[model samples]
Target: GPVPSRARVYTDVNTHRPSEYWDYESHVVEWGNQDDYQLVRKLGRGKYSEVFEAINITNNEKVVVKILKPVKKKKIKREIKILENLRGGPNIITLADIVKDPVSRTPALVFEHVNNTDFKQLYQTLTDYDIRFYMYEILKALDYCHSMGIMHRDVKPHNVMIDHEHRKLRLIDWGLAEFYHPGQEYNVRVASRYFKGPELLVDYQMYDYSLDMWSLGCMLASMIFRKEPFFHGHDNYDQLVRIAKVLGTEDLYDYIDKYNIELDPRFNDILGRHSRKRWERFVHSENQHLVSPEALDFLDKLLRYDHQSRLTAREAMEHPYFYTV
Candidate 1:
């Protein structure tokens, strides 16, 4: 496959030399005692780790315990290093501590607890303004991380913990995130299927921070459109087709040709021409209250097939959709 040569937004954000950001071996985790924390219940699980709601018995404070499954040592270090580096950034999840089980030697990460209502139920109760507010909050986190030279490969509703009553949002799950070195070829198999960006689906490497913006756009689309997953693809190949159905196939080819991306052979028979679907087409009686012209305009810019063309988090934060919020 031909690598993309485009320089995305934030290409020069981390031009300085820093082994800790690029080399995982340089990360020295100051491991804490896992015995200090007691798991209250399993919160959730992902491919990389199992998350649990826990308590820091030492301080009697609530916290999140992420017990990492057996994976490459480098991955565990990368996640810890990135979390530590972004600790105080706005809306970024705070890592309280890192520990390992003595018997299994399995690593675990302790983080600040968020009282998040599952987005499925919570988003249904929110007004239009609420969606804009939380989306803006997410942009703050995304912008801050990108400015710090990290691209959060995973940015979805599940990763965004929203405490509705407090009106707080935190971006979590750094397991798939990586330092945004310009011209770096990232793993396309990072984000969740529903939120995977066009760059990933098309097998384009060398993607930059703009990739998060695409995922963010997918998130926004689902929220306003009232579709749990705005693009519901059966698999990875179908993922591209689902996007093309809405964004149009011509633009997909344009993006591929512009980046010189080599399409997988499977797409030859499955790929069909599609005209771009208007955002208004998704608006109906049930979801009309959440749809707005500013929302549509904002989604249009962020959901572009070409990664470079998507709105950067900073730019998206300044869009009209967030103006009234």
Candidate 2:
């Protein structure tokens, strides 16, 4: 409702590139040979797709098949096109091929197989070194994606694939991702609720690359604090309050005021003024081992009310949390 906020970095990215780079519908996908892949096992399922561990019959190489399940056809085009846009990106999920049945016309994406342990159990076992190591790896992918002018709006523990034994991490699930143009208003109906940043909670559509940093901070907080979800919000309004409860309601008001955001009257009952809770308050004997001075400082920097105030993915990599000897 007021002046729009631009990305602190990479603001004019899509403006310099060809229209085809950001134009999803214009992308004509080159469907690959489907007979070469055999679905081996179910990996996961979502509203729009069923993911399976598959094998390349040509050479018996392991692969992942993400079969689109009757969602908007254009969305499938966007994901396929975005994958092509980010081909060979560092620590980003490798897209092997895009295929569809000839008669049925069902489309699927082939990705390099990752032998990933479920984060439900894996996060509990990550050593301090492992946390920093893997976080740094995903930061590489985020920095690269943003440099290409795309936002991986769905950044969460589930979207991050980690083969801890191999020290591998891949940022996956770009279906919710979009290209950024300066001063453009975007739909705020992105990202999962618990990981949603304040911009989304307050309906600030002019957010940018820093949206992922808030989600990254959410992941880091859960790891260090041993909570499945660092913020336990039952609904959207509750989600904002959950953040305000920790980050401070006053700052939330400051953020909304700066953007001239008008709150939903429904929030009158739930949203209350709050003092910013200190990061160290989350530390206890159970989590103190992971809560180093640098770790707390880094988390504080990321989980901020202002998106622009949050560290960029590259700056996060340079934080003391990752640079410590």
Candidate 3:
């Protein structure tokens, strides 16, 4: 196991609040009438929930309905509590109400609608300024949550809602997020495979808000390089191999040593020593339009193997990538 490590900044945000604030197990959710919202269409589905495009009957406004998929009560309560704590923060999802199916007792969370295009197509049309602007919006939301002592373990393109026309971005899906206390060891199986940070892959559970920064780095690299996932790993071990190929094996070993991390036996056989590739090496004629010196510099800092070496979201906002934005 790695040594206990606290966040470089905002280390004691949860301690300032009463135990009732971060303790989601005791939360009693007040359910709203499910009839209050009418489902318009199926938006998508995930392991934990089914999302729908819906209309709020009470206000006659557009909204989203996310129905839980038989999740445990504590898990459901956690998401609600985190949303309640981060409500009205910059670009954080606005939770409209919580309701439950009368018969099955399945719960659903209603959120304000965001007119967003899928990231795949959206990234195609985004100008460099648009990328910086929206990414800055993500940073603002991240910093707010981090300062609140919450780590958004699910930071990925899919979780971020962006309305390009309105230039608004909302960080959605707090299901994987958790409250961070100093010396706490978190489950490393949180973020999606592609976006999982090094600390997670190496089983370093004493991580902090910097995990979100690494996820952001992957998203940024994918967008800039016109790659869907900069780290294209097939499975859990392959994921480390993918990152090692780019970040280099020796440096990854150093990170493993720092944390005294143990690895699966397959890692040794599958991962041969590889040299670190330079940032400029990824530049190609196809993606040159989106590439910039500052952009690469910004990405370089966030994708480091040492989570502590990564930039905090607040510090990232001041990066030159957002200077003109």
Candidate closest to the true structure, highest lDDT: 3
TM-score per prediction, in order, is 0.96, 0.97, 0.97
Give a tens-digit lDDT track for model 1, residues 252-296. Answer: 888899878888888978978889888899999999999989999
- Show the colliding residue pairs in model 3: none
RMSD of each: 1.5, 1.1, 1.2
lDDT comparing candidate 1 with the true structure: 0.88
Candidate 1, pairs of clashing residues:
none
Question: Relative to the unseen true structure, what is the Cα RMSD of model 3?
Answer: 1.2
lDDT of 3 by residue, 59-156 (tens): 88999999999768889999999999998999999998999878778899999999988777797798888888888999999999999999999889
TM-score of 1: 0.96
Candidate 3 global CA lDDT score: 0.91
Q: Best to worst by lDDT, what's the order?
A: 3, 2, 1
**What are the per-residue Cα lDDT tens digits for candidate 2 across 109-152?**
99998889887778678788888888888889999999999999
Q: lDDT of each model, Cα atoms only?
A: 0.88, 0.88, 0.91
Cα displacement (Å) at residue 272, model 3: 1.0
lDDT: worst 10-residue window of model 3: 256-265
